[PDB]
RNA sequence: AGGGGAUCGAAGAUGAUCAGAUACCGUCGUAGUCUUAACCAUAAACUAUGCCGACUAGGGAUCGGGUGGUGUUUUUUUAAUGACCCACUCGGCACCUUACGAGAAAUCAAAGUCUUUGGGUUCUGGGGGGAGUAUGGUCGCAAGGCUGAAACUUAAAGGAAUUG
């Protein structure tokens, strides 16, 4: 059954962008999905996501713009320490300068650059490029 | 892709599709460039003026090139009420 | 030989083995 | 952007409706649902003539702006399109390929039929699917008089007309020729009609 | 490999179907298999219709028929040429000529 | 998917599957079973000393054809009577 | 069989393509014509060519061939294609109901009728 | 004494088009090989492999040679050709011609902050040609190329200096190994990058600009 | 074990073919084939395709249900009803085209969303033979089932497709 609503959201998004769609209707939503999309949007990888609020769990419509190669989830959410953030980046990001690893720290959901700056670490969530 | 002294490298920049904004490869022999006419007053499409579009092989083969052309032409004013935003 | 008949051969052999092992107290 | 002289022109609308072009096929092929206007009872679908003419003027604006206007090539394999394409070719540059295509005619630079166009026009994509494929191989747009139940693969701009009547096919060829001529061509005063009759672009029995 | 996608002949969701017997060899071939044909003949073939009509009472009454449903094993089907080995690309054809 | 477990707490299951499939491995099975001691002609040692009992010319296998001129020797420390091929030309003239 | 080959058949189609009005329907006349207006290295091969030429000439007089055309055939086809009758009122436009709805929603005058 | 045969050939012979930069830029079809004979002087080849393929006929055993040959200048362009011919010499010749036809551009990048003429690839890349997945990882300066001899010579022809090259599948088939590496080098510009995110005015097809030097004679 | 035992029919008997024919073909026929009460527990038990979930591509049929139609036929004057037609819809068994992708290929809308590898989880495989063997265990009236090696030997065995 539905086990990883965030994984399913990112998989729907990846499929839509591969197909060449411009926008995708994700279901159900969540706070971690909202925060993940917000990180993406901050870095420019998606456009605007409108959160349809029915009473049950909500749905999201995410107007894309291309320029998002692959978004994915790392499950389970391994505990990455500040010294192993590098190992994760090197293992699942294409080049050393672009693409972001997205952690779930006790300072909120953030990217790995923000993580290195605020000097916090925690559970890995996914990755985008 | 510039280098230390802000000087440009990466011998050439690729053309990006105008439907999905995906890079149009060098070997994408299905990639197509439509050049429509800029018409001045009273017909007589002035020669030498092109409203340029670049459609990618993926879009054309999957068969939505006409959809994307209708949308882009309406977006650039080439047409009036042929493509509806909400299907 | 055919796998089915080879199985039947080893079946009969297993039966004979069991018989002699049972005759041997 | 296109000035208000380029509307449907109820006279040309009369022509289209009389030639019976607004009729489509019974299968929709969702890639053509925009072009479908309404569903006629007794299982017939009604093409939007308004969008038909608008796409026609767009295709004409594409067929213009070719500097050497003979390098347009026009394909037709049906019977109902052969005289149409011959007369269209006679008017504009438009090297015609009537009858059969002799495949490998856009690749294989040593054949005698080796055209190297910058645009193609196909009367029936389903039956010229070889010319479509060759244009795919060698990087060429497409302007096709598609039907509703016509494969939109590797087709650029499409004009939904009928692909099942003599009059529809020939008359769409006629209007496209007229519009590409009027774009610059030499047919000044768009407000003045054209002498050439669609009977010219109609195929006799013979 | 898999010579046929329909695995030889059509079951697709039963699991088991009662078998019938061939008519030449009497071999228990499942019913989804077993090339099936319909023999609709006249008793009195036109080699003899006019003879019968010439020699018959009940002027122009009728001519009855013989209906038979024939089940064939694949071996005897191929042997009696009800069916033939077809090309690899025309195997996929289903329509009856 | 991928058939294995991926929960954050399935280390025991992963470890036990690895431990069970290392036996389907080949060389690991030999190492742990300890064939080099319980069964092998040498005691797992790299060399071994023997007393030449007899001299056997044995015919090679097809498609070749030759005599191979080996010596049937008996190991001193174990007692397994093995057969030792003799190296280059004439060395059987050397071994009595 | 008397199944003549590509040599003679291509030669005959081409000679009828470029010498239709001069050629005639008689075997001997066509034969001598070929003699004088060909460089061919056999009387036997010339006779085969000329015989196929007479046969093709007969079927050409009876109808058109799928293979070859002449200057004359090109001209007559030009005119037969140029023929035009009076174009396609009988009053208002023809039967139209939902397409009539189309034209009302599109905004034309279009004198039409019902169905 | 080569003569052009196509439109693009006419233009490159009239010298109005002078860069495969522009050719690729407009994804034009290179049908003649003499055009890059003009457009990439100093283009060196390397005959990767010669192998006999055989057909088993009525009485004999028809043997012909399949030669795989790579070509490249040294800076950002490679091509690869495979040819089958009755003799090894003709095989190599036509393989070189086909390679020159299939020359393709490669995008070199940095392994970190940019300094002095990129050395490595832009991103990790992968290419699969029938069970051989060749993967290319960028590398820092002074790491050199670490790959099989064949792919190493190919990437050396390409001009990439520092690449880490994973690999998987039956790499022993050099035809498929080099085809995979070729698809990888193509996917290089295949990838879209935050550098390339910006917009461009969509240039105007030298075919269309010089259409008059492009018509027939 | 008990009943019933028409048909067909292991074993067996006989006739022919054959060099022979303990087989194919032919006549006969025992256990069996059927049922009740108890055992077994395996099959090419097959979709050689684990179960749950999510998304990605068009098309037409069809089964069960549901919605709509100043639609068709029906009683006897046309309502109800039933069945049929049209549009859609939910769950099915499948099917047609493409290759967008996957694959070693055959081929697959799932064998896709896998080097741009991570939705949850169970079981199994690690070159071929020896070998589903020996042994020990456990279940079974028995046949047998489950569990299951090694010594030794070998460079192949195998899968998909091409040319003969
Ligand atoms: Zn049978």
Residue numbers in the entry:
A (entry chain SW): 2 to 130
B (entry chain SV): 1 to 87
C (entry chain Ln): 1 to 25
D (entry chain SA): 2 to 207
E (entry chain Sa): 2 to 98
F (entry chain SX): 2 to 97
G (entry chain SR): 2 to 89, 96 to 122
H (entry chain SC): 34 to 250
What does the publication say?
For structural analysis of Lso2-bound ribosomes, we reconstituted idle 80S ribosomes from S.c. in vitro with a 10× molar excess of purified recombinant Lso2 under defined conditions and performed single-particle cryo-EM. After refinement, we obtained a structure at 3.4 Å average resolution and local resolution for Lso2 ranging from 3.2–4.5 Å (left), which allowed us to build an atomic model for Lso2 (middle). Lso2 is exclusively bound to the inactive 80S in the unratcheted/nonrotated conformation, as, for example, observed in 80S ribosomes stalled with an empty A site. In our structure, Lso2 comprises 2 α-helices connected by a short loop. The first Lso2 helix is located in the intersubunit space between small and large subunit. More specifically, it occupies the P-tRNA binding site and the mRNA channel in the P and E sites of the small subunit. From there, Lso2 bridges over towards the A site of the 60S subunit, whereby the second helix stretches below the central protuberance and extends towards the GAC and the stalk base. In this position, Lso2 would overlap with an accommodated A-site tRNA. In conclusion, Lso2 occupies mRNA and tRNA binding sites on the ribosome that need to be accessible for translation, thus corroborating Lso2’s function as a ribosome hibernation factor. We observed that under near-physiological buffer conditions, reconstituted Lso2–80S ribosomes were almost quantitatively split, even more efficiently than puromycin/high-salt–treated empty 80S ribosomes.
